[PDB]
Amino acid sequence: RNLPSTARYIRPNLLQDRLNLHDNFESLWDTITTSNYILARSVVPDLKE
């Protein structure tokens, strides 16, 4: 598909961590890191052969 210039799209806010949760928010960072770990497990490929 080609999209005209009449079209639009919204950009996400991808501004980095303003809080530094890896600096003495260890209880939150554990959950976050676990969340990204278990998410990453769902996308690493299976050893097909």
């Binding site: 278990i38 497990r41 769902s42 996308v43 299976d46 050893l47 097909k48």
Partner: protein, 1086 residues
Amino acid sequence: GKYNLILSEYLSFIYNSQSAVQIPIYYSSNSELENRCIEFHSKCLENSKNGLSLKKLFVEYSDVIENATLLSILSYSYDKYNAVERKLVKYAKGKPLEADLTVNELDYENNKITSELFPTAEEYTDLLMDPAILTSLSSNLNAVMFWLEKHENDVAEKLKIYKRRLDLFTIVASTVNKYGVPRHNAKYRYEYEVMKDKPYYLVTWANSSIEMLMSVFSHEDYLIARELIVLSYSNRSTLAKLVSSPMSILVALVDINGTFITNEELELEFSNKYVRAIVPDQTFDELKQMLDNMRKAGLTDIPKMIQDWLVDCSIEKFPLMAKIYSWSFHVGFRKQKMLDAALDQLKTEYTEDVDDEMYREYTMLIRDEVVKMLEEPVKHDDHLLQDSELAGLLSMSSASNGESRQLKFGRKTIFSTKKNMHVMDDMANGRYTPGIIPPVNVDKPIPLGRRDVPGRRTRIIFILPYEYFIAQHAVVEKMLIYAKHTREYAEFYSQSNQLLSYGDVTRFLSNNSMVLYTDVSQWDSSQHNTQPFRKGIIMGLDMLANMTNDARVIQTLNLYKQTQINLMDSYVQIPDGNVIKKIQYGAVASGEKQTKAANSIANLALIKTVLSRISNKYSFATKIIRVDGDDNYAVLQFNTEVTKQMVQDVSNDVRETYARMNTKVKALVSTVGIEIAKRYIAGGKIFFRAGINLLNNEKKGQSTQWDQAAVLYSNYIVNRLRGFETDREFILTKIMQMTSVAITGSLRLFPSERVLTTNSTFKVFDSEDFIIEYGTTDDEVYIQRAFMSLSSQKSGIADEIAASSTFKNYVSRLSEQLLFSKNNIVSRGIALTEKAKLNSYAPISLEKRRAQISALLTMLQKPVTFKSSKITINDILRDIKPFFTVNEAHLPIQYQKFMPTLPDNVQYIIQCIGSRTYQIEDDGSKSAISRLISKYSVYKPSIEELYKVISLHENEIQLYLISLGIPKIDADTYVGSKIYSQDKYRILESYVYNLLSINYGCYQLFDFNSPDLEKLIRIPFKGKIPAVTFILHLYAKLEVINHAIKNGSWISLFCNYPKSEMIKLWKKMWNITSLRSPYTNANFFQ
């Protein structure tokens, strides 16, 4: 150690009379105490034979009652006929049921009175509702009433179950008591004279309803059971087919969150992959129409249970569906007529409007696949093709049941269906002529058998002569051997004892892929299994004929070709009452050595041809195809993510692309799920179908009263693991009533837990489900030694058949067609081997097994036997046990659930150790002694025979192996090579595995290669006696596993076993006298 009390209570309840007396008999391995048991026996017989009170002696011999072991209980009660009704009147205070004749399509498929369908007995037949099982309806009713009576005083959740099942049995018994009970004859058939004035389909409905209501543990079970039992009384053709049909759509609605994979045939490697469920809209309209039919039939609660799940479409509430999918197949069989069952298949729509671009490609692909199978052996001139005649003639035992024909072995007449016996007959009378293949035409149409399975159509079975088998055998064995390592033959990719039974879909499931799965069981009368299919094979044979130089091989190929010529035009004998119909059916069905793999080929070619037509509108890469008989599935991956419209349009294109070859289909496309005959997947989790009727069978087998109880217990265990759970006490009541034997009109014997649960040819069940039991005691050892002496029995029929002239001629012809000039040194060996394959003929087996049971019974009556030292398994375990020490452990949970429907203890084990990952040879097929047998034959020899044969000198091994069709040079080479010493250990492995059901049942599902199980089994290593450390580690594993199953908790072990005992056991190794019954195995995959 609880069963015998239930036996006693059953006896007390069923008989209830002053005249009903109860007579235990005991035994002990210690002489003095045994003589006191003998005394008690004696005095009891006397007292019984003098109308004196028995209750006084029971104190005097208290020691025997506490420490000695029970065998059996006798029972003296007279005829006292019709007492079942005289008890049953109380449980029938509900309203009886009225049929509704305008439900089933046909007339005779309604549950109306026999006289409205068979006024004369000369045209009556009970075969359309025959349970075909050696157990009575009255047995079932008595069992239910005993359960209800003993559970008449409980106050718990059990009482909430009891009120429900009591209401169900009220609903049933009101209907029954309205007319009465049909009375079984000696053969467990039901004659005209009882059914003449009663409904024809009352028996199967009754039994099925009893089985269902005995499998109620929850509210939804009550709703489902009440909603099927009351409608299955009238509808008998469109019910299990109805509720079992939507499931195929429902699997396409469950999001995967977590997955299982397969690598090689039992490997797993789980994946946390998530996959959504891109279901189109029109399949919901289809599903809605199906539910409208469901409500239109008279179903209220179970659509609601199917309706409230769609609000979430969650996988946690989903096992209900799976439970429901098993509640459909426990209603019975649709035993309709041969005619109308054939016409489910014999409706044909053959048209000169199909493509020609498709069939020519189809034919060619079949040709090419055949050539891939047969290029190497046809070219390198393998021995097994040259001597295909002799190969098939040895392998006749692994064939189908030919049509009954009148034989005579000297001074008898036989109507055997076994084709080896047919061959024996035709050699003598000059009729054996395997090169001239018979036609199949008007002058000689073909018989039929019926392959049934509930909730589906009836398939047909060819029943051919013995030339067709011989032609097809060798070529089909090389084709199968080729398919052992080819992935795409789902029926046959294995490593010599397995199948890819956990599927190979879940590798490439993702947001971009889809999978089209399709039932192909109705594709037997179709236009693509006729002419093109046969002609492709004919073409392949032409190429292969030009791919060899020897003449025997070209003749064999020409005979296989001529077989396909005759199969291209084939007529079919079908009676209907008195007259006989014959219909042109020049196509494929089962009942042949070739049908399975060849249908797999043809479906593969068909799907490969169809799947190159979706390519006209989509770009995809075919990642995997699998074809197995009555189903097939292909996965395919896209350049992007999937939508509803691509699914819909692909489905329409697939449907129309099958229509272009004039082929009907309920085309099914999905993203997460499949449904097939033997299994189905939802959300990356394998479920299974629990549809094995226990109290009703498919056809009438040949087993005894005894062994059908064992078969039923295996099916019970299986169905329980699948999810369909029946209350175990009812099953035990059935087992005791089926092992009960009438010695007179009023004497009847009932064995005990310690006779039925011991490893022998008489094992039936286990005291604790999912656990075989062994013997650490004197007494279990004692009786095992006794029963092995009695398991070996004779068959006078076999002895007299082997002494006639025709059998002798057959052995002589085998010899001189194989080797000559040793007419009194090997030929006798060949006769002894032919004896090993006469036993397939059923009456011989019945003679032998009835002899075993009678010999058993003449020491169940009287006291016990010492059996003279013959070593068995419990002798070994007796010596392994006293150097153990148990300690409490605590394993964590690190393995994933993928069979939710299991009981929670087995799942807890699977959720703490792994699931099995290999499959080690029950047959020892990979063993170097067996790779000769699989090269020159197909023959089994049972692991008892191999374990015995290896124990002999190096001389008779040659005789025994050459007698199995093998030549002499390779046997001599095997003995000189000293490979049997490299195979004692494998054979013993397989032997011990067969003895202990390690590849048969629950133990097939467990990882003994685990690191977690191993660290508990701390038996240090000594070395150079591998068998002992092997059995020690295995038995210690079994200890831990049995403790886990029976108590949930875990334990460790430790065995600092002394070398002295290592050496004492090394000599006891290869002199074992033990055996396990064939009828006791419970294959989870049937």
